[PDB]
Amino acid sequence: CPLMVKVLDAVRGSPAINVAVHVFRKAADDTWEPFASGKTSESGELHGLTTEEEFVEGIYKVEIDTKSYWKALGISPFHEHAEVVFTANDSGPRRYTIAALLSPYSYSTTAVVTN
Amino acid sequence: CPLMVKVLDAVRGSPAINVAVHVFRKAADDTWEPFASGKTSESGELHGLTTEEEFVEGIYKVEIDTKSYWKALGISPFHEHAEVVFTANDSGPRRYTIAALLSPYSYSTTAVVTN
Amino acid sequence: CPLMVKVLDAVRGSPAINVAVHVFRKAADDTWEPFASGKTSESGELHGLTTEEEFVEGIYKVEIDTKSYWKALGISPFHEHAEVVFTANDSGPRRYTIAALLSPYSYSTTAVVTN
Amino acid sequence: CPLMVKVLDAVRGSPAINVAVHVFRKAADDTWEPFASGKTSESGELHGLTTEEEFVEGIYKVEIDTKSYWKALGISPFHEHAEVVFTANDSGPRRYTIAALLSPYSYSTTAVVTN
Numbered sequence: 001c002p003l004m005v006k007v008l009d010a011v012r013g014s015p016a017i018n019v020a021v022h023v024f025r026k027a028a029d030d031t032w033e034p035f036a037s038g039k040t041s042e043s044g045e046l047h048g049l050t051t052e053e054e055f056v057e058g059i060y061k062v063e064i065d066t067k068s069y070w071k072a073l074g075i076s077p078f079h080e081h082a083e084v085v086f087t088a089n090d091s092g093p094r095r096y097t098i099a100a101l102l103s104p105y106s107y108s109t110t111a112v113v114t115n
Numbered sequence: 116c117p118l119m120v121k122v123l124d125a126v127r128g129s130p131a132i133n134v135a136v137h138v139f140r141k142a143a144d145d146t147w148e149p150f151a152s153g154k155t156s157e158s159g160e161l162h163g164l165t166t167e168e169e170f171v172e173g174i175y176k177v178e179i180d181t182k183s184y185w186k187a188l189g190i191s192p193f194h195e196h197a198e199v200v201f202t203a204n205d206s207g208p209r210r211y212t213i214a215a216l217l218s219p220y221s222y223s224t225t226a227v228v229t230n
Numbered sequence: 231c232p233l234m235v236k237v238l239d240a241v242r243g244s245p246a247i248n249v250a251v252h253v254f255r256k257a258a259d260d261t262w263e264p265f266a267s268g269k270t271s272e273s274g275e276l277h278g279l280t281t282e283e284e285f286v287e288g289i290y291k292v293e294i295d296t297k298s299y300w301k302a303l304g305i306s307p308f309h310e311h312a313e314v315v316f317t318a319n320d321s322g323p324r325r326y327t328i329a330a331l332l333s334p335y336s337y338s339t340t341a342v343v344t345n
Numbered sequence: 346c347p348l349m350v351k352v353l354d355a356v357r358g359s360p361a362i363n364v365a366v367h368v369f370r371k372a373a374d375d376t377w378e379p380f381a382s383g384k385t386s387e388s389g390e391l392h393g394l395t396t397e398e399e400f401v402e403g404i405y406k407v408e409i410d411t412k413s414y415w416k417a418l419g420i421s422p423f424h425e426h427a428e429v430v431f432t433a434n435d436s437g438p439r440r441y442t443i444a445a446l447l448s449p450y451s452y453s454t455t456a457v458v459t460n
């Protein structure tokens with residue numbers, strides 16, 4: 001899957017491997033509650049963050065640790081991190097792919113939402 | 116400017132006009148303190164957010180109200196907003212341009228940082 | 231596969247299906263010779279354009295018919311098409327994935343190259 | 346202007362200076378005729394390619410020499426160049442700004458069209 005995060009590296013032209021991703025869900029008290037976490041695989045993908053039943057209606061934040069990624073490569077990047085915040089599953093179940101393309105001073109994200 | 120935010124609309128091929136932008140600076144208590152706010156002009160640009168002297172070293176969050184923009188056009192977009200979070204002015208004064216390209220299910224941002 | 235093309239729609243947050251893709255190899259007269267073609271599937275993907283044996287070193291042009299895609303949705307887009315021109319296999323056989331994210335007035339493309 | 350091209354570097358967070366830009370107009374033999382050329386300035390901008398009087402209706406190709414740009418920085422990039430092909434002035438005179446954001450394996454381009 002219901003949630004997949006895919007991260008590519010625009011400098012090297014490869015998947016961005018081992019990028020930490022933390023997901024949060026907005027709580028009733030308007031706090032961000034830790035919902036899930038993982039690291040992208042060798043293919044730059046992170047599957048298994050949640051299940052269909054667990055991925056309930058709500059507002060989610062997907063936080064991608066871009067800074068740690070670039071610093072590990074010896075680069076001081078511009079952004080502290082990259083966040084994607086969206087309402088999910090408010091009109092029935094969907095499969096969400098959050099895709100992110102990274103450069104040291106830039107990132108681009110899109111969502112692919114299907115049945 | 117020392118800080119400029121520029122927003123374009125990829126559906127219409129024009130500046131994104133009247134987009135609300137809120138800027139915050141991280142406080143000692145690790146809270147986000149309201150730092151500035153404005154709306155993009157007819158050219159999709161927002162100048163005059165701060166001055167050189169006021170734009171001190173720190174971590175800033177630039178929050179772009181993409182959701183209100185799309186909803187006003189009768190579109191239900193994917194993202195709640197678009198945020199850009201970065202350290203600024205920690206190696207001398209700089210001019211920052213935060214540029215953002217918007218589509219209903221996607222945005223792309225880059226920074227241009229000069230002397 | 232060694233050549234894969236994937237096309238996403240940034241406005242609707244979906245794969246772009248049935249998009250015409252035409253590939254060319256550069257000739258010693260600087261003319262562009264037809265190499266292969268197809269349309270994207272329901273997942274927005276186009277596989278099987280070529281084989282590891284037909285895909286020798288050269289300069290290739292990948293043309294994606296974005297105009298037809300948009301016009302069918304009732305949209306009059308900016309570009310005639312999106313183009314990706316690159317040298318392939320110059321360092322020995324590789325697998326290429328060309329991704330294109332589409333909006334009426336913008337396109338973004340990236341390449342993942344694997345060995 | 347009626348034709349402006351602006352090129353940014355997503356890796357360094359700076360304008361891309363001295364980037365060669367070649368424009369062509371499509372001919373009735375489907376051949377590409379030289380229309381105008383130049384290099385970007387220190388602000389990454391190229392103005393004065395053409396006049397409102399030479400810029401009649403037609404299909405134009407804008408070619409940006411991204412390869413030379415990267416190789417000078419010691420980087421072996423993916424693309425031979427970045428291309429933007431579009432119909433112009435078909436609805437009467439307009440002003441076009443073509444923006445390109447560059448990374449070694451990716452480019453993103455958008456158009457702002459004004460009347």
Ligand SMILES: CC/C(=C(/CC)c1ccc(O)cc1)c1ccc(O)cc1
Pocket residue numbers: 006007008099100101108109110223236237238329330331338339340453
């Ligand atoms: C084209 C969208 C996309 C990407 C990959 C991150 C993208 C995102 C933003 C851009 O500006 C360009 C491409 C992508 C999505 C799913 C994949 O399996 C592979 C690629």
Ligand SMILES: CC/C(=C(/CC)c1ccc(O)cc1)c1ccc(O)cc1
Pocket residue numbers: 108121122123214215216223224225338351352353444445446453454455
């Ligand atoms: C090319 C970067 C850029 C933009 C405009 C928002 C951009 C951003 C992300 C992309 O994927 C493509 C273009 C821009 C920056 C300053 C300007 O005066 C005009 C345009």
